[PDB]
RNA sequence: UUCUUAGACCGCACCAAGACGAACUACAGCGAAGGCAUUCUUCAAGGAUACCUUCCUCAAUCAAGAACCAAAGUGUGGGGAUCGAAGAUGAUUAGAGACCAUUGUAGUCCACACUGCAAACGAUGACACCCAUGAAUUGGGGACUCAGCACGUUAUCUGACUUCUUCACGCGAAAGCUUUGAGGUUACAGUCUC
């Protein structure tokens, strides 16, 4: 796997309608100071979250919504 | 029966023309008369922000060189086309007389 | 080797022609010619099942195999022409675009004087349809 | 792979842009007598104008510019003009509606048996006190600004070359000139040249060719 | 369904053939109506305005009669790119040339003939008089080199199209109509016709 650590940074707001997920973004402490103009993913979440937690990410480049 | 609307549902004045081209729909091929037709303008961008950022840093003669430019068009659309993508919705009586004219 | 030995330590310029459709994707490679190519990639190969080889994923997947076969030919730098659909399509790309771009930028490859090129009549025949739409 | 056969060339434009090689192209081996240098020959490379003089890059880096093979030599390719366009979203800036719409074309015949259809493009200011939603025109103050147009450059165009006619399209020399005394007949918003085909191409000629490059690099 | 190693899709260059003229294009214009949109040239017109020119009642409206008339249809010849009734094939469905998808003939275009059948609507016949509130637009008129010019502002006027989503009186069963009438009509009669 790839476990990169990412501060939840705020509550984005709300996306989905089932009362499961949340649409919210992720910023990277990860980087050491190395290159990321990314700079804050927004990453859709399944189940609670709030703002300071820490979470891994599997993936990186993430748009979430799209257009699809 | 009931004059519902004045002009119609059109831009065309009674005793004047009483013919205007038709004009197709970018939705579903539909033809209408273009007074009657849904005009709108889009502006719609090359990138979203967040890819702009990243692509803006592999650019030096471009992003932060020149501003990017933007896909422009004229939207024509159905009446039908309009009201299901709700961006023509009802309106109570005092509103529907209501005009912005061609200014958004 | 292959690519650039008589260009090389200078940035070349490619162009990438993405023509972004809700059917499939592509990505292509010329040369500023457009007579000779090297790469043809189509979001089909990538990813299987037809709603999702247009879909964002199929693009940026697409695009990691643009930049293994571009270190090849030499190419570093990349203009990009942009084409949504032809003339009596309509004026919308697929969701295939704006996702490539991304991911040849951050896989290394330089982009500068992106374009929009695409076929607009200034008229043409009559549009596919019917006068009562296609309901 | 089918990079075994391949090789480069590179594209160098005439003295009158001030980038040589502005390109590093490839080209097939001649495999037998089927011959690169005949491939060669009439293949059209594009460009940036900015990227190609670094005068007037500023004005526009909305402008191409193309050109075709007249000659292959060395790994040099000797090169002429061919077309000079305006891209497709830089005109949509300009154009404002309510405001008219001019155009024209004019076929502009050089010193030399080279011919140019000029396409060319304006639109109508509203002037400084305004009340009226309109800046519409009548007909006569549009076809009679078309008449000042095609003489003009016509008039220029006829006793200069086809070398030095592509540095007043470049370096917007015309425009100016074009703009300037148009506007007493209409207050016009720009002029602009839209696109340049290049219609008849007189000859092949080795040495007004190599001349109009000045040395090879 | 359909097209592909006999190299499709894709990119560039060039050529062929036919249609169309986007955006700009509008609570804008012209035409008796139906209708009419690239540019240049060309032929004959039409409306508006300006005038201390000309004519002097030559008018208004209409059975009869005559001319024009959207699209689809019919005859003959030319053309046939695109779209496309019929037909064919694949889905969708309980059933489905269905609506949808891939195709495809007539037709879609032009010339010369017919047809005169539309929500041909402003569902408002034509001519004439009187009738108030505000802000605009479209033409004309008034206070070098297609050039004693062109545009704009202030104000006025005549002619057109319409808005007050602060239209006055009034009318109407109401919706609505308002110098642009369905107003000036039981206090019932300007004129003609269907």
């Given at each position: 796997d790839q476990a990169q650590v990412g501060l939840i940074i705020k509550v984005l707001g709300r996306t989905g309608?089932?009362?499961?997920?949340?649409?919210?973004?992720?910023?990277?402490?990860?980087?050491?100071?190395?290159?990321?103009?990314?700079?804050?993913?927004?990453?859709?979440?399944?189940?609670?979250?709030?703002?300071?937690?820490?979470?891994?990410?599997?993936?990186?480049?993430?748009?979430?919504?799209?257009?699809? | 029966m009931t004059t519902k609307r004045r002009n119609h549902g059109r831009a065309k004045p009674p005793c004047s023309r009483g013919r205007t081209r038709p004009v197709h729909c970018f939705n579903c091929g539909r033809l209408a008369p273009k007074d009657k037709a849904v005009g709108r303008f889009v502006v719609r961008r090359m990138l979203d922000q967040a890819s702009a950022r990243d692509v803006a840093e592999a650019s030096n003669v471009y992003g932060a060189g020149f501003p990017m430019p933007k896909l422009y068009m004229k939207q024509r659309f159905c009446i039908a086309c309009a009201i299901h993508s709700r961006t023509v919705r009802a309106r109570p009586t005092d509103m529907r007389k209501r005009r912005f004219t061609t200014k958004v | 080797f292959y690519g650039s030995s008589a260009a090389k330590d200078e940035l070349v310029y490619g162009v990438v022609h993405i023509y972004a459709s809700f059917n499939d994707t592509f990505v292509h490679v010329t040369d500023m010619s457009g007579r000779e190519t090297f790469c043809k990639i189509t979001g089909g190969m990538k990813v299987k099942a037809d709603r999702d080889e247009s879909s964002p994923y199929a693009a940026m997947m697409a695009a990691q195999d643009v930049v293994a076969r571009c270190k090849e030919c030499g190419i570093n730098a990349l203009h990009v022409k942009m084409r949504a659909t032809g003339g009596v399509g309509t004026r919308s790309p697929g969701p295939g675009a704006q996702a490539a771009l991304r991911a040849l930028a951050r896989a290394g490859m330089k982009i500068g004087r992106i374009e929009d090129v695409t076929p607009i009549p200034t008229d043409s025949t009559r549009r596919k349809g019917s006068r009562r739409g296609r309901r | 792979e089918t990079m075994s056969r391949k090789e480069w060339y590179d594209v160098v434009a005439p003295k009158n842009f001030e980038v040589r090689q502005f390109g590093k192209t490839?080209?097939?081996?001649?495999?037998?007598?089927?011959?690169?240098?005949?491939?060669?020959?009439?293949?059209?490379?594009?460009?940036?104008?900015?990227?190609?003089?670094?005068?007037?890059?500023?004005?526009?880096?909305?402008?191409?510019?193309?050109?075709?093979?007249?000659?292959?030599?060395?790994?040099?390719?000797?090169?002429?003009?061919?077309?000079?366009?305006?891209?497709?979203?830089?005109?949509?800036?300009?154009?404002?509606?309510?405001?008219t719409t001019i155009e024209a074309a004019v076929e502009a015949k050089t010193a030399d048996g080279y011919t140019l259809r000029l396409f060319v493009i304006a639109f109508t200011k509203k002037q400084s006190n305004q009340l009226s939603k309109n800046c519409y025109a009548k007909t006569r103050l549009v076809k009679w600004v078309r008449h000042r147009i095609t003489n003009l450059i016509?008039?220029?165009?006829?006793?200069?070359?086809?070398?030095?006619?592509?540095?007043?399209?470049?370096?917007?020399?015309?425009?100016?000139?074009?703009?300037?005394?148009?506007?007493?007949?209409?207050?016009?918003?720009?002029?602009?040249?839209?696109?340049?085909?290049?219609?008849?191409?007189?000859?092949?000629?080795?040495?007004?060719?190599?001349?109009?490059?000045?040395?090879?690099?």
């Amino acid at each position: 796997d790839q476990a990169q650590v990412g501060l939840i940074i705020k509550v984005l707001g709300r996306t989905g309608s089932r009362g499961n997920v949340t649409q919210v973004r992720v910023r990277l402490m990860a980087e050491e100071g190395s290159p990321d103009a990314n700079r804050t993913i927004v990453r859709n979440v399944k189940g609670p979250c709030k703002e300071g937690d820490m979470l891994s990410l599997m993936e990186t480049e993430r748009e979430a919504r799209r257009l699809r | 029966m009931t004059t519902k609307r004045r002009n119609h549902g059109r831009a065309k004045p009674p005793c004047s023309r009483g013919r205007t081209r038709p004009v197709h729909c970018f939705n579903c091929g539909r033809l209408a008369p273009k007074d009657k037709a849904v005009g709108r303008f889009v502006v719609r961008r090359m990138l979203d922000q967040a890819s702009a950022r990243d692509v803006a840093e592999a650019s030096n003669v471009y992003g932060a060189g020149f501003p990017m430019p933007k896909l422009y068009m004229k939207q024509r659309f159905c009446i039908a086309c309009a009201i299901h993508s709700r961006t023509v919705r009802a309106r109570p009586t005092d509103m529907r007389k209501r005009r912005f004219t061609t200014k958004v | 080797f292959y690519g650039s030995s008589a260009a090389k330590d200078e940035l070349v310029y490619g162009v990438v022609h993405i023509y972004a459709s809700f059917n499939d994707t592509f990505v292509h490679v010329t040369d500023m010619s457009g007579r000779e190519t090297f790469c043809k990639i189509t979001g089909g190969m990538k990813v299987k099942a037809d709603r999702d080889e247009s879909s964002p994923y199929a693009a940026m997947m697409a695009a990691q195999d643009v930049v293994a076969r571009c270190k090849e030919c030499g190419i570093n730098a990349l203009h990009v022409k942009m084409r949504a659909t032809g003339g009596v399509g309509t004026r919308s790309p697929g969701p295939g675009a704006q996702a490539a771009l991304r991911a040849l930028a951050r896989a290394g490859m330089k982009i500068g004087r992106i374009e929009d090129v695409t076929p607009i009549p200034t008229d043409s025949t009559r549009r596919k349809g019917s006068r009562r739409g296609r309901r | 792979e089918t990079m075994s056969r391949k090789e480069w060339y590179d594209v160098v434009a005439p003295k009158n842009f001030e980038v040589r090689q502005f390109g590093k192209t490839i080209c097939n081996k001649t495999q037998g007598t089927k011959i690169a240098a005949d491939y060669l020959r009439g293949r059209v490379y594009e460009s940036n104008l900015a990227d190609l003089n670094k005068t007037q890059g500023d004005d526009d880096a909305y402008r191409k510019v193309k050109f075709v093979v007249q000659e292959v030599q060395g790994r040099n390719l000797l090169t002429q003009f061919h077309s000079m366009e305006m891209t497709s979203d830089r005109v949509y800036f300009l154009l404002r509606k309510w405001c008219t719409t001019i155009e024209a074309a004019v076929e502009a015949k050089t010193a030399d048996g080279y011919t140019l259809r000029l396409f060319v493009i304006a639109f109508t200011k509203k002037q400084s006190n305004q009340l009226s939603k309109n800046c519409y025109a009548k007909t006569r103050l549009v076809k009679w600004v078309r008449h000042r147009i095609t003489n003009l450059i016509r008039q220029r165009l006829s006793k200069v070359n086809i070398n030095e006619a592509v540095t007043l399209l470049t370096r917007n020399i015309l425009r100016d000139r074009l703009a300037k005394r148009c506007n007493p007949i209409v207050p016009l918003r720009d002029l602009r040249i839209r696109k340049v085909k290049v219609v008849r191409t007189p000859r092949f000629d080795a040495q007004a060719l190599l001349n109009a490059h000045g040395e090879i690099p």
